[PDB]
Design a protein around this ligand. Sequence first.
Ligand code: NGT
Length: 559
Amino acid sequence: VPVEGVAGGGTAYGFNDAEPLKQSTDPSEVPTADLVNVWCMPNTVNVGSQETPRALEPINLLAARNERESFQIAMRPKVSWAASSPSGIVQVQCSDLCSSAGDRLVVGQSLKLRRVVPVLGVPDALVPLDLPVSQLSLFPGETSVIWVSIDVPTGQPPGQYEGEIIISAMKTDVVSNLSLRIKLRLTVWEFIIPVTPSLPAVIGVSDTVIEDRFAVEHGSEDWYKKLDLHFKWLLQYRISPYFCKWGESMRVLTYTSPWPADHPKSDEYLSDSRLAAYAVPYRQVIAGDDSRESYLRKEVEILRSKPHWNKAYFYLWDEPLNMEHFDNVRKMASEIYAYAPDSRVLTTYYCGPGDAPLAPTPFESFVKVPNLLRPYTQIYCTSEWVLGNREDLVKDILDELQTENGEEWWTYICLGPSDPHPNWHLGMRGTQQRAVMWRVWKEGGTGFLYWGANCYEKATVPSAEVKFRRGLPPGDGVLYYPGEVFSSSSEPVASLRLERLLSGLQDYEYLKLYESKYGREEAMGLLEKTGVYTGPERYTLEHRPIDVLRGEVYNTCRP
Ligand SMILES: CC1=N[C@@H]2[C@@H](O)[C@H](O)[C@@H](CO)O[C@@H]2S1
């Protein structure tokens, strides 16, 4: 290209004409591909509206049984093919996928499509499209994206499955030689991801938020319907929900099942294979004629008789700060041990007592907390922020614990840690979201807690603007959104962060498989040598290393 440009257009005119466009913009005579750039992107990219076209290649995926695997489709108009509201509408159709043997993953149950919609200008909300045929408006100068997810049943036969997604520019069956065909190929392999998550990831759900936003009075018939809707939707993400009301001095009432332990709904919840752990409330959920002491005796007496009691825990206090709080936990714990001594009590903390340090510094007072509470807490759930990027001081935490007697170390994340550490704050990248669980795996805790998934600011209408709480990083405490904000459906809308939480929990399961066949040192070394995760401030920034790791697990760990 000369200094004056091609044909005298001036500076830099003509650096790639980029294939002349065809001169017709008529979708009934021009191939879609000549009207719209379409390509695929990995599930770990947050695909912004200014992402540049790449060349469409076929997509080759891997998934175990009982695994969701995902990818994305990007679309950006080259021209108007609807002169009159640009750029134009496309139709999207997906097929079933089918193996040689003639086994199927069906559109609708396995295979789903969602649009990726920005929240505060960041890609985050996954809104459903009609199946098997949908339509999407494309605007000029904007990349528009679709999240394709495939859920493989636990019973699904292994094999190479294959299919197609068809994109057709429309004028305003539409399929023709003019349509663009995306070729999908998925290998289903022999691993079954455990039906019961190997890591209990307990996730709070605020009942106040539901009461105010969906306008349902606590205790009512309609309230039970809304918590049921939530509880069932959330199980698909390999988490163990609990509802949560906060109390005087950050006591918490926490409860997985709003049903009395008597009801047949209680056992329908609590012995679900998908549910790894459940909160049992200390006080009555619904008001009663009984005293709390009276109710608790009766509830524990039932529950301990059931085959699911091993999944029970009690979460009584959110971050005791001072001595009185630590004392309260001990009193309340022993109340409970009197009705069943094998009760597991969980306590979240980031500090020792402020007014009565247990040592000459904060971190060492923090480390001594088990000694102050033993044996009146079984699950010591600690704030990750407290460690900074010192993965070496994990041992200082574990050295005060008694694994051999049923004590466990768990972690949680919240308004900290921050960039560039793994978390689920809006603006954080996809690998940084998925790395929460790479770090949980590496550091060796036996479970995980997130304080809230629906902790919006207060609203009194289902479809109200989703606004975020003052003083917190937007996204902290919010992993999913109301259906009705984005459509007329009541079904919750997942965040990208919630999908990357699931993918990260699937990753945990691959790493546990590999560890069980080649040992701890070998699995630690896979996670690092592949480039996936080195430390809290050093993890992959790209997708390939993840494929390398999952691929190495498949090659080495089949029977
Ligand atoms: C457990 C946790 N206890 C606290 C919560 O009460 C706050 O709402 C949250 C805000 O980030 O931070 C930590 S997480």
